[PDB]
């Protein structure tokens, strides 16, 4: 049948003795994530990594959901999307991921805005868009996109994460239709909210929202607003306000994402190019005051195999 190449993504399973969890960066009701060093058996190289230990799965269906989340995470191989290093099937499943010290992107902008250069913002937007498109190329829908779900290895480099929501697409199907689950409203495209329908075009809407957050240095969208309204207002046609920084050229794009009709909103591939175009000259596009002024362990990416 289809000529598509076999996907040889390899899922490594790890003994607990293989890694240790030094401190815990974050604790989640869904899961706990630990700062940890994973040392592969054999090679005396320590890879700093982050471990997520998820809550026990009460039901098999939950069990399946993890496997898929793992399945994709292992599968993806791009710079701006973080691959899953390995899994160990302990009673409480533990997922091993590359460790990004700076942490949540949303968190970073909030704490580094003053030092937060305009040029960086254009680049991140490029980087994020670059990642999502790859996801689009894989027929993968990232159900949840937010600043929160983007992690910074460094200010220079950022990659996507937190895919549990994300679902793969049957070739026949253009769109993926959800069943009721906890969802954060502000990011979701109306089509998703009203009809529990997701498509990459759905993702873009959220992606645009992420940019808004970047532009605003983490200001929370629809701040102080109930989830329920959100369906109503957009139907209303209200949209997130322009970033003070943004040139209409930029804020304009973000608006385009929020267009009610999915097809009308820009395809991701487009976004990378356009933003990249801005990136060559951020200064014209983004107006930031004082803009001009603005040991024994090997990292995994270095770790990754070379011909
Ligand atoms: C915006 C909310 C957020 O970022 N939470 C969060 C941050 C985490 N975190 C951190 O707080 C400090 C350092 C740090 C370094 N590397 C990572 C790597 C991966 C994650 C992560 C979180 N969720 N999925 C992956 C976090 C990291 C760091 C850690 C967890 C959370 C939830």
Nearest atom of ligand 1 to the alpha carbon of 148: 1
* CATH number, domain with residue 115: 1.10.510.10
Q: Could you tell me the resolution of this structure in angstroms? A: 3.3
* CATH number, domain with residue 61: 3.30.200.20
Give the whole-angstrom CA distance, residue 137 versus residue 141.
10
Asked whether residue 32 falls in the same domain as residue 135, the answer is no
Active centre residues (catalytic): 144
The string of DSSP codes covering the chain is ---PPP------B--GGGEEEEEEEEE-SSEEEEEEEE--SSS--BEEEEEEEEPP-SSHHHHHHHHHHHHHHHH--BTTBPPEEEEE--SS-EEEEE--SSEEHHHHHHHHSTT--HHHHHHHHHHHHHHHHHHHHTTEE-S---STTEEESSSS-EEE---TT-EE--SS-SSEE--S----TTTS-HHHHHH-EE-HHHHHHHHHHHHHHHHTTSPPTTTT--HHHHHHHHHHT--PPPPSSB-HHHHHHHHHHT-SSTTTSPPHHHHHHHHHHHHHSHHHHB--TTTTT---B--HHHHS---
How many A from CA of 260 to the centre of ligand 1?
33
- Residue-range definition of the domain harbouring residue 55: 1-99
Closest to 120 (Cα-Cα) out of 301, 241, 278, 299: 278
Give the whole-angstrom CA distance, residue 262 versus residue 188.
12
Contact (CB, 8 A) for 36 and 22: yes
Q: Is the CB of 26 under 6 A from ligand 1?
A: yes
Q: CA 139: distance to chain centroid?
A: 16
> How many domains are there within the chain?
2
Asked, for residue 302, whether it belongs to a domain, the answer is: no
Query: Which residue has its alpha carbon closest to ligand 1 atom 32?
Result: 26
How many A from CA of 103 to the centre of ligand 1?
5
81 Cβ contact partners less than 8 Å away, ≥ 6 residues apart: 131, 134, 135, 159, 160, 161
The alpha carbon dihedral of 157, 158, 159, 161 has a sign of positive
Q: Is the CB of 101 under 6 A from ligand 1?
A: yes
How many A from CA of 26 to the centre of ligand 1?
6
At 163, list the tokens.
């895919």
Asked, for residue 304, whether it belongs to a domain, the answer is: no
Experimental method used, please? X-ray
Asked whether residue 108 falls in the same domain as residue 58, the answer is no
Asked whether residue 36 falls in the same domain as residue 76, the answer is yes
Asked whether residue 122 falls in the same domain as residue 249, the answer is yes
Maximum Cα–Cα distance for the chain, whole Å?
61
At which of 40, 72, 99 does a domain end? 99
Asked whether residue 59 falls in the same domain as residue 153, the answer is no
Q: Is the CB of 151 under 6 A from ligand 1?
A: yes
Give the whole-angstrom CA distance, residue 240 versus residue 225.
12
């Amino acid at each position: 049948p289809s000529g598509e190449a076999p996907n040889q993504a390899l899922l490594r399973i790890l003994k607990e003795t293989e890694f240790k969890k030094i401190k815990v960066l974050g604790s989640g009701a869904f899961g706990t994530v630990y700062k940890g060093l994973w040392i592969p058996e054999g090679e005396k190289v320590k890879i700093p990594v982050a471990i997520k230990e998820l809550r026990e799965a009460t039901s098999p269906k939950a069990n399946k959901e993890i496997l898929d989340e793992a399945y994709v995470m292992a599968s993806v191989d791009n710079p701006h999307v973080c691959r899953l290093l390995g899994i160990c099937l302990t009673s409480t499943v533990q997922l091993i991921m590359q460790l990004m010290p700076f942490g949540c992107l949303l968190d970073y902008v909030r704490e580094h805005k003053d030092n937060i250069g305009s040029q960086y913002l254009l680049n991140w937007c490029v980087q994020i868009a670059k990642g999502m498109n790859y996801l689009e190329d894989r027929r993968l829908v990232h159900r949840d996109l937010a600043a929160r779900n983007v992690l910074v290895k460094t200010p220079q480099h950022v990659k996507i994460t937190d895919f549990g929501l994300a679902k793969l697409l049957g070739a026949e199907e253009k769109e993926y239709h959800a069943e009721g689950g906890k969802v954060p409203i502000k990011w979701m495209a109306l089509e998703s909210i009203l009809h529990r329908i997701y498509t990459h075009q759905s993702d873009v809407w959220s992606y645009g929202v992420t940019v808004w957050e970047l532009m605003t240095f983490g200001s929370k969208p629809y701040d102080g607003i109930p989830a329920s309204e959100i369906s109503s207002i957009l139907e209303k046609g209200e949209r997130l306000p322009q970033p003070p920084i943004c040139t209409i050229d930029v804020y304009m794009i973000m608006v385009k994402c929020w267009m009610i009709d999915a097809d009308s909103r820009p395809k991701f591939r487009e976004l990378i190019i356009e933003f990249s175009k801005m990136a060559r000259d951020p200064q014209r596009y983004l107006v930031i005051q004082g803009d001009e002024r603005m040991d024994v362990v090997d990292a995994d990416e270095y770790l990754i195999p070379q011909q």
